[PDB]
Structure 1
Amino acid sequence: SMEQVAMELRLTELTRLLRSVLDQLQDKDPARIFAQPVSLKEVPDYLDHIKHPMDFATMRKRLEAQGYKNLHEFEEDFDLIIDNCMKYNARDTVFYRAAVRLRDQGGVVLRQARREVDSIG
């Protein structure tokens, strides 16, 4: 159906906008602290602590499979990156400190992306 194709064109366009958002958020992590999943070889107990791991690479795989239906879903995964880090690591650590900065810096990017998604439908 032509409806199914129009809905697909919207998913694709959302996917293009989210790829750009994702790039912008990841530039706010110049140390690549959140680039890849926490290693279970190196933190073998990690899943006893964190039930839903997240990282930018795993977001990116979901994104290119057009697995985000809306901004809310993408924001959920971004928030996991930050929240997981802020529970597992203590306040006085380079890791926690990097999440706070990502959170604060990403807030601006996310504010405008919400407006763009609303605006362009």
Structure 2
Amino acid sequence: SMNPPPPETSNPNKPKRQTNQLQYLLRVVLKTLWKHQFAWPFQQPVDAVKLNLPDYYKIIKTPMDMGTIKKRLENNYYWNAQECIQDFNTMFTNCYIYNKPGDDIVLMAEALEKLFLQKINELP
């Protein structure tokens, strides 16, 4: 059960813009979630081979992680702030999909999602 390549993070042909919303998403949202005690399973793509999770990429067809989001923000990959917010939401929902209600990893993702929402509440 091979891992897929990680999501694309840079496209020099995509037009680029700097907005207050995108700057906040990197400098506040991504930065704060990265430093959360429970962030470490979400800082890079799920390595289903190393973790012995052969069904991970049979269930999760839209993988996402904070390492990918960080790169997308740095590379001006997002034009709309909603694209970034959607990626964070895909990351949390993937965890809820693969796992089950009450699992430790689900409770960790729920705590990160609650911090995300406290930070997004304050978006420009």
TM range (shorter): 0.7 to 0.9
Higher helix share: 1
Aligned length: 106
- Structure 1: stretches of 5+ with no match in the other structure: 1-6, 117-121
Q: Which amino acid aligns with 2:34?
A: Q
Q: Give the aligned partner of residue 39 of structure 1.
A: 47
Deviation at 1:13?
Answer: 4.0
Given the alignment, which residue of 59, 63, 69 partners 2:69? 59
Q: Give the aligned partner of residue 87 of structure 1.
A: 97
TM-score by length of 2: 0.75
Moved more, 74-83 or 11-20: 11-20
Task: Check the 8 A contact 1:29/1:98 in 2, yes or no.
Answer: no
Structure with bigger gyration radius: 1
Moved more, 90-99 or 26-35: 26-35
TM-score by length of 1: 0.77
Could you tell me the percent identity over the aligned residues?
A: 31
CA RMSD of the aligned region, Å? Answer: 1.9
Task: Check the 8 A contact 1:29/1:102 in 2, yes or no.
Answer: no
Q: Which has the higher relative contact order, 1 or 2, with Cα contacts under 8 A spaced 6 or more apart?
A: 2
Deviation at 1:31?
Answer: 4.7
Q: Deviations over 1:62-103 (max 9, x none)?
A: 111101112100000000110000111112321000111111
- Structure 2: stretches of 5+ with no match in the other structure: 1-14
